[PDB]
Structure formats: C-alpha cells, structure tokens
Amino acid sequence: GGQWRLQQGLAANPSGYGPLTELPDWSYADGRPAPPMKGQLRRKAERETFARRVVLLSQEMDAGLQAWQLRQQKLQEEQRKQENA
Amino acid sequence: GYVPKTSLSSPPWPEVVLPDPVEETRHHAEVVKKVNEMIVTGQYGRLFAVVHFASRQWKVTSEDLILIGNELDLACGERIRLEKVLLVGADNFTLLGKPLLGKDLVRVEATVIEKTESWPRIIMRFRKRKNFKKKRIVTTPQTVLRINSIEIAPCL
Amino acid sequence: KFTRSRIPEKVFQASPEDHEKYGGDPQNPHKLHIVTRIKSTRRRPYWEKDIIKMLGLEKAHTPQVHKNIPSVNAKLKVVKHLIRIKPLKLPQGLPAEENMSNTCLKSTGELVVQWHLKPV
Amino acid sequence: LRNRVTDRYFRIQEVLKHARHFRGRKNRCYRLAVRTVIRAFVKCTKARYLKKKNMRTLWINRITAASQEHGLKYPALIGNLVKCQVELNRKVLADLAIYEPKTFKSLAALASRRRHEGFAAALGDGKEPEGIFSRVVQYH
Amino acid sequence: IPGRQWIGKHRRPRFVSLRAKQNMIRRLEIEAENHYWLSMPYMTREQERGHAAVRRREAFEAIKAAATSKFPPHRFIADQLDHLNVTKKWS
Amino acid sequence: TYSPLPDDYNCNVELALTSDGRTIVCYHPSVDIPYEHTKPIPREEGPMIEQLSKMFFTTKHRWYPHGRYHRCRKNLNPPKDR
Amino acid sequence: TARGTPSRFLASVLHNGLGRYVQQLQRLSFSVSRDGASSRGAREFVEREVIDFARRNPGVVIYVNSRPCCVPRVVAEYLNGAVREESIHCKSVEEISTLVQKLADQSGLDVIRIRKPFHTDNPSIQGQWHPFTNKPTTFRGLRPREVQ
Ligand SMILES: [Mg+2]
Numbered sequence: 100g101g102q103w104r105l106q107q108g109l110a111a112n113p114s115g116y117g118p119l120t121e122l123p124d125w126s127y128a129d130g131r132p133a134p135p136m137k138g139q140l141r142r143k144a145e146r147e148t149f150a151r152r153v154v155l156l157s158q159e160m161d162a163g164l165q166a167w168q169l170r171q172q173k174l175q176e177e178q179r180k181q182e183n184a
Numbered sequence: 185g186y187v188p189k190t191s192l193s194s195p196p197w198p199e200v201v202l203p204d205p206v207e208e209t210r211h212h213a214e215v216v217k218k219v220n221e222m223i224v225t226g227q228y229g230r231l232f233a234v235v236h237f238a239s240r241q242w243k244v245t246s247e248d249l250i251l252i253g254n255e256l257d258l259a260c261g262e263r264i265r266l267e268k269v270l271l272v273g274a275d276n277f278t279l280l281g282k283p284l285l286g287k288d289l290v291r292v293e294a295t296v297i298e299k300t301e302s303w304p305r306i307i308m309r310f311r312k313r314k315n316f317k318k319k320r321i322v323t324t325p326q327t328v329l330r331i332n333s334i335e336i337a338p339c340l
Numbered sequence: 341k342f343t344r345s346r347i348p349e350k351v352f353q354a355s356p357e358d359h360e361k362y363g364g365d366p367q368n369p370h371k372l373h374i375v376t377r378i379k380s381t382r383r384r385p386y387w388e389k390d391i392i393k394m395l396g397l398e399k400a401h402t403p404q405v406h407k408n409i410p411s412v413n414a415k416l417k418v419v420k421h422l423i424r425i426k427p428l429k430l431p432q433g434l435p436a437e438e439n440m441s442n443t444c445l446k447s448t449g450e451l452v453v454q455w456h457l458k459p460v
Numbered sequence: 461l462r463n464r465v466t467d468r469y470f471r472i473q474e475v476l477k478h479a480r481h482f483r484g485r486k487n488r489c490y491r492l493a494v495r496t497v498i499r500a501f502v503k504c505t506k507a508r509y510l511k512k513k514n515m516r517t518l519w520i521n522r523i524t525a526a527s528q529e530h531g532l533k534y535p536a537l538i539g540n541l542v543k544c545q546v547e548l549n550r551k552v553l554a555d556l557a558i559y560e561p562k563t564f565k566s567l568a569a570l571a572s573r574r575r576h577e578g579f580a581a582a583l584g585d586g587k588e589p590e591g592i593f594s595r596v597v598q599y600h
Numbered sequence: 601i602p603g604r605q606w607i608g609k610h611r612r613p614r615f616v617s618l619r620a621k622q623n624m625i626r627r628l629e630i631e632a633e634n635h636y637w638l639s640m641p642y643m644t645r646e647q648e649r650g651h652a653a654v655r656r657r658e659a660f661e662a663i664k665a666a667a668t669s670k671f672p673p674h675r676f677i678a679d680q681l682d683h684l685n686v687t688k689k690w691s
Numbered sequence: 692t693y694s695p696l697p698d699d700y701n702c703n704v705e706l707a708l709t710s711d712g713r714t715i716v717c718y719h720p721s722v723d724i725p726y727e728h729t730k731p732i733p734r735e736e737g738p739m740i741e742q743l744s745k746m747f748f749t750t751k752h753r754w755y756p757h758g759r760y761h762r763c764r765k766n767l768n769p770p771k772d773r
Numbered sequence: 774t775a776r777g778t779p780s781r782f783l784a785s786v787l788h789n790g791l792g793r794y795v796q797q798l799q800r801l802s803f804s805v806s807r808d809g810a811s812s813r814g815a816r817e818f819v820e821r822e823v824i825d826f827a828r829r830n831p832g833v834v835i836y837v838n839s840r841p842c843c844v845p846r847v848v849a850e851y852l853n854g855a856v857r858e859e860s861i862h863c864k865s866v867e868e869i870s871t872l873v874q875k876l877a878d879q880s881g882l883d884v885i886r887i888r889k890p891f892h893t894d895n896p897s898i899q900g901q902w903h904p905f906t907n908k909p910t911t912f913r914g915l916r917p918r919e920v921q
Contacts, residue, residue: 100538100543103542108446108448108598109447111447113283115447116446117599118599119236119270119284119547122268123267124238124266124267125237125264126264126267127262127263127264127265128264128293136238146441147440149443150440150441153405153428153434154434156371156406156407159651159652160371160407160409160642163643163647163648163651163652164651166650166651167651200576200693202576202577202580202591203692205589205592211707212592212709212716213710215705215706215707215718218718219707219718230895230898231898232898240549241549241552242891243552243555245895247788249783249784249892249893250890250891251887253890270547271548271552271563273898273899274898275562276718276721278717279714279715279717280546280567281713281715282545282546282715283546283547286713286714289714295790297789298797298882299878300879300880300882301879301884303778303885303886303887304884306501307505308498308501308502308505309505310498310499310501319501330790340709351635352639353639358639361636362636362637364640365640366640369641378630408642408643409642409648413638413641416634416638420631420635423634424630424634426637427637455600457599459597459600460598460600481777483760501774529907530696531696546715557902558901559896559897560898561701561899561906561907562702562721563719565701565704565719565907566702568696569698569704569706569717570706570715572696573706576695592708593715595712597713686813687810689808690807700906700907727912728912728914729910770780772782773893773894
C-alpha cells in the first residue's frame with residue numbers, strides 16, 4: 100500500500116526512511132546506546148553528500164545570476180561612458 | 185431523489201452507522217483505563233512481542249531463540265534491550281503502536297548465546313554450451329539470541 | 341528509419357490550467373530538480389543510455405538533484421520518458437554546515453534540514 | 461610418464477560425496493554424477509528465490525484463509541492495516557493467524573473499522589471530521 | 601496459428617486488458633508532469649553561460665592530474681627482508 | 692451498538708486508542724461456550740485396501756507398500772522440536 | 774545442498790541463556806611444531822596471543838603440545854562432547870585470533886543446516902487455532918439437518 104504512503108508524506112516503502120529503519124535496533128541493558136548500524140552510517144553519508152550537492156548547485160546558480168547581472172551593469176556602463184567627447 | 189426498493193436500488197452491503205466520535209472517545213477512555221488496570225494489577229500472564237529487529241519482524245516470547253544472519257559486534261552473553269517492538273500481546277489484551285511502541289512502555293531483553301557461522305552454502309552458476317561453470321562456497325555469520333524477558337510498563 | 345526525435349517548443353509551454361493542476365509558479369520558478377530514473381534504459385537507443393549515464397541516473401528509484409537551466413533541461417528533454425521530474429522545494433532554508441548531516445529528503449520533494457525521528 | 465596424477469581418487473570423491481542419495485548410476489559413476497551434481501547445485505541456488513517466493517505466497521494463503529474466517533478478504537485486510545500505520549508484515553500476520561487468533565481477530569476488527577471509516581469518509585465528501593482510527597501520526 | 605506465434609505475417613492476436621490501459625495511462629500522467637516541470641527554467645541560456653566553467657575546469661584538472669600521476673609503486677627493504685621469516689624457528 | 696466484527700464466537704474485541712493517539716489498545720476477553728449450547732455426553736490385499744480406503748476416505752495408492760529403497764531412505768530418527 | 778546434508782532445529786545446550794550464560798568451549802588443543810614453516814603463525818600466536826586469550830576467558834583450559842607436527846591443528850572440545858578439529862596450517866596470527874575466537878564464541882552443536890531461524894517452546898499464548906475457533910455455537914449443540 101505505497102500510494103497511500105505517498106499521499107501521507109511517508110516513504111513509499113515502509114523500509115525506507117522513518118522510524119522503522121532509522122532508530123537503533125538495539126541497546127545495551129545498562130542503557131548504553133549501541134554503536135551505529137552500518138546501513139545508517141552509509142545512509143547518512145548518502146544524505147550528507149546529497150545535501151552538499153544541493154548547497155553546491157544552489158551556490159553556483161546564485162553566483163551565476165549575480166555574475167550575469169554584473170556583466171549587464173558593466174555593459175550598461177560601457178554604453179553610457181562612451182556617449183561623450 | 186427517492187428510489188423504490190429494487191435489487192439494484194440499494195447496495196448489496198448493509199449500511200453501517202459509525203458511532204459518534206465524542207462517545208467513542210469516551211469508550212476509548214474506558215477501555216484504556218481497564219487495560220491499564222490489568223497492567224497495574226498484574227493480571228496478565230506471559231507476553232509476546234513482535235519486534236522489528238534489523239532484518240525483519242520476529243514474533244517473540246520470553247525464553248526463546250532467534251537466529252540472526254549477521255555478527256553484531258557483541259560478546260557472547262551480553263544483554264541487549266531490543267527496541268523497535270511493535271506489537272505486544274497477552275491472553276486478554278494487545279497493544280499495537282503506530283508503527284512502534286514507546287520505549288517507556290515495553291522492555292524486551294535478550295542475551296547473545298552463540299556467534300556461529302552458517303552451514304556451507306554453495307553458489308553454482310552454469311550456462312549450457314557456453315563453458316560457463318562457477319562454484320562458490322559461502323558461510324554467512326550468525327548470532328543466536330535468547331529473549332530473556334518481556335516486561336511491560338503501565339504507561340497509557 | 342527510427343531516428344532521434346525532436347520536440348517543438350509549444351510542448352514545453354505551460355498553460356494556466358496546468359499551472360493550477362500542478363503547483364507551479366511561472367513567475368519565480370524553482371531552482372533545483374529532483375530526477376528519478378523509473379524506466380530501464382534497456383530496449384532504448386544508445387543516446388538515451390548515454391544521457392542517463394551523464395545525469396547520474398544509473399540506479400533506478402534514486403533521486404538526483406540537478407539545475408533548472410536550459411542545458412540540463414535539454415538533456416532532461418531527451419530522456420523525459422525514462423525519468424520523473426519534481427521540483428526540489430525547501431520549507432526551511434538550504435542547510436548550513438551546522439545542519440549538514442541531520443537532513444533527510446522526503447518523498448513529497450522537500451529537504452527537511454532538521455530531521456528528528458520523533459512524533460509531533 | 462614423468463609426473464602422472466596420484467591424487468585423483470580424492471577429486472572423484474569430491475564430486476561423488478554429493479551424489480550419495482541419487483538414483484541409478486548417478487550415485488556411482490563419475491561421468492553421470494558430475495552432470496547431476498552440477499545440476500543439483502544450480503537448482504540449489506536458483507531455489508533460494510523460490511524459497512522466498514513460496515513462503516510469501518504461503519503466507520498470503522494463510523492470511524487469506526484466516527481473514528475469510530472473520531468476513532474480510534485479503535486486500536481489505538492488508539490495505540487497511542497499512543492505512544492504520546500498523547506495519548506488521550505477512551510472516552507475523554500468518555503467525556498470529558495460526559498461534560494467536562484473538563490478536564488476529566482484533567487486527568481484523570481494526571482493519572474493518574478503518575475500512576468503514578474509509579467508506580464513510582469518501583461517502584461524505586467535503587470537509588468533515590476525520591475518523592478516530594483514520595488519524596495519522598506525523599513524524600519529524 | 602500459422603507459425604511462430606508472435607513474429608510473421610499471420611501473428612496471433614494479443615489484446616489490451618484494463619491493466620495495460622491503466623499502466624499506460626499512469627505512465628502518460630507522470631510524463632505530462634515531466635512536461636510541466638521542464639517548461640520553466642530558472643535561467644535563460646544567456647544567463648547560464650560560464651556559471652560553472654571554473655568548477656568544470658578544476659574537475660578536469662583533477663581527472664587529468666589523476667591520469668598523469670601513474671607510476672610503479674615504491675619498493676622497500678623491509679618487504680624483501682621480511683620474506684626471510686618463513687624459516688623462523690624456536691629454540 | 693456498532694460492532695466492527697460480530698463479537699459472538701472467539702473473543703469480545705474492543706478497540707481503543709490512547710489519548711495521545713499513538714498506540715491501539717485492543718481488549719479481548721475470551722468468549723465462553725454457553726451451557727445452553729451443549730449436548731450431553733452419550734452413554735486379502737485388494738479387499739483390505741478397499742476397506743481402508745473406504746474407512747479413511749483416501750485413495751487406494753497409499754496402502755500398497757513401497758520397496759527397500761524407500762524404506763531405507765527414510766530418516767528413522769528425525770529431529771524433534773517443541 | 775540441503776537434501777544431501779542433514780538438518781536440525783535451532784537449540785542450545787542446557788538453556789544456555791536463561792539463568793546464566795555458560796561458555797560452551799571446554800578445551801583447546803594446539804599442536805605446534807617447533808621447527809616448521811607450517812606452524813609459524815601458530816608459534817607467533819603462542820608467543821603473543823594465547824596468554825591474553827587464556828586470561829580473557831578462564832573457563833577454557835588450553836593445551837599447547839609442541840610436538841614435531843607437519844600440519845598444525847587446533848582441537849576445540851565442547852561441553853556436550855562435540856570435538857571440532859580445525860587446521861591452523863599456514864595461517865597468520867590475526868587469522869588464528871579470529872579462528873580461535875570463532876571457536877570460542879560458538880557451541881558444540883553441529884554446523885549442519887538449521888531448519889527454522891527461531892525456537893519458541895511456547896509458541897501460542899492465546900491458544901492455538903483449531904477449526905472450532907472462529908465458529909459460533911448453536912442452541913442445544915445442533916448440527917445442520919438435525920431436528921431434535
Ligand atoms: Mg508456429
């Protein structure tokens with residue numbers, strides 16, 4: 100029943116992100132938390148490099164627009180400053 | 185918009201009338217109060233938990249065994265609290281959470297007994313008339329867990 | 341001869357019925373695409389297999405962020421039958437280096453930069 | 461012969477120990493035993509997929525039967541247990557269907573209750589108060 | 601059927617069930633939403649020009665530099681002398 | 692007066708949510724059999740295989756024997772469980 | 774395969790986890806040649822690691838024999854009489870630490886196929902299914918087409 104889960108903002112597969120697969124599976128009985136799961140470590144590396152790509156692409160987009168705008172202002176000033184002599 | 189009662193007039197299923205939500209939430213207050221009384225007074229016998237341990241969902245009593253298919257970097261004999269329990273039942277009540285239960289509500293304990301390997305497991309590939317024949321032999325690691333206790337906590 | 345196919349520009353000009361159907365804005369559009377390969381590139385031509393390699397969509401059902409620029413969109417117009425395109429919406433801001441690891445992209449299309457595992 | 465093979469008995473016995481339960485001369489003669497032992501190993505690896513498949517269809521048969529005991533069918537039971545965020549899988553529900561049938565009856569009443577909240581929900585369209593078991597738990 | 605069911609002049613017929621219609625329809629709907637989101641670029645083609653030329657240049661400097669740094673590995677005395685312990689004894 | 696299942700045969704199912712709305716408390720006591728729903732306690736190879744087949748309602752084939760090869764492949768000490 | 778190999782059910786020795794955990798490995802028996810390249814990493818295991826291993830679990834008694842062997846062996850003997858003899862022939866020190874720790878961690882059960890991945894001995898708590906669960910009784914216990 101994954102189309103319902105897409106309607107609810109959940110993962111389409113219940114083994115995807117969420118509380119069944121991202122909490123730790125077990126703890127010590129003393130209360131010590133376990134060392135982290137291998138798939139949770141790999142998965143948080145995937146989410147971290149994904150977020151790094153989102154930031155990197157967003158910064159290239161903003162720097163690209165601002166560089167275009169500075170090129171257009173320099174073209175307008177090379178239009179205006181030659182209107183004399 | 186009236187239709188005379190023919191066969192295809194009204195649907196073949198009976199019309200169910202769902203209860204009013206105020207009285208039904210009061211009924212849930214009564215039932216949760218009673219089941220909390222059975223947990224406080226200790227009326228329950230032995231429990232079972234459905235716990236979503238790593239690979240799948242294991243139905244679990246106390247005093248039983250689970251064979252997992254990985255090494256868990258633990259010593260043989262160390263106690264484990266299994267979190268991600270997601271159903272807890274007794275003879276006369278259950279407790280199923282959405283999707284998991286509260287850690288302050290159910291405490292499932294289990295020791296590691298033995299960290300074995302599996303029986304040797306043959307992986308042969310063979311395509312006819314192409315001289316394609318590969319044999320591999322694989323033993324996965326395994327740990328066995330003795331679920332020591334399913335303790336339940338009167339927190340509803 | 342089955343050749344490469346061109347697509348005219350009226351195909352990629354949205355209508356206000358489409359702007360009301362899908363929740364887009366023509367003024368102030370979105371920056372980042374989420375692209376997801378959902379149709380195998382086998383039984384497809386080699387140029388489509390190449391574009392799917394160029395977009396990093398070699399695994400199926402794995403989202404990939406791209407730019408909403410006409411060059412990237414030209415490659416996406418080549419393989420638009422093989423993918424799924426959604427806008428990357430960002431409810432909270434784009435994550436800083438403090439919130440860099442504690443993110444999760446949801447199935448709706450939003451990148452939630454504070455990702456607890458707790459219910460509301 | 462300068463160096464001819466001495467250790468050859470053990471290669472024959474490497475293959476033939478897997479043939480010890482076959483019929484015919486497949487348990488005895490090496491030429492026949494290599495083909496049937498290779499073939500038994502190929503079936504042994506291709507049957508892991510069929511083990512998983514046949515267990516799952518066996519569980520859907522057991523959940524189907526025990527849900528027909530409570531008047532429901534299988535797709536109403538599974539779809540409406542999904543819609544309650546009770547994400548028990550097929551193995552557990554077959555094991556409750558066998559060993560703990562009060563719990564399976566209460567899951568059947570929860571799933572049919574949610575099914576009727578879906579019927580009354582999609583019946584009275586527009587804004588209406590939601591069902592009680594129809595609420596979802598939002599995680600963040 | 602005349603021969604080999606599915607290729608030839610006289611092929612057997614195959615018909616489009618409701619499964620196949622609903623599958624093709626939902627593929628067309630996903631396709632039409634792809635047609636919506638490709639209709640609104642964040643930049644024009646003039647504005648995108650050269651916005652990532654530096655990062656692409658440094659990326660190919662990394663690939664070029666990984667190509668031109670390929671050479672035999674270092675050879676140590678401790679490996680060759682370390683072979684001599686194959687006749688390590690007790691006493 | 693609403694019942695999601697006809698709570699008449701196995702257990703009296705009473706569904707509940709907690710007030711925080713996260714767990715589904717189900718309460719189900721066992722239904723006793725009523726005393727009025729009870730009755731008081733009352734106080735040659737061919738022919739033999741037709742008689743056993745007619746007796747246990749199975750076909751004739753599982754009564755004819757099987758040879759030494761199938762009597763001596765049978766695991767005579769199988770693993771017990773539980 | 775699984776039909777040529779025997780199988781068994783997943784068990785323990787004397788309910789090995791319930792009350793207390795008992796180390797199931799009684800004796801290790803190393804036989805290590807003094808002069809010989811086969812038992813080199815065995816010798817380096819005795820010089821380095823068998824003492825710290827012998828202290829990390831004192832319920833195991835260890836017999837290093839040091840005879841002129843031509844292939845070194847380790848012989849793990851378990852509490853239930855099982856004896857698993859494995860060879861440490863031409864294996865490095867780390868591989869013998871993982872091998873000996875593997876023999877220490879497991880038990881004297883066979884390494885044949887295990888049928889079920891679990892073992893309850895009380896599988897049913899609400900009462901097992903029989904065909905008269907989920908069937909309502911009728912008045913006077915009557916069956917169909919019965920008049921009186
Ligand atoms: Mg033909």
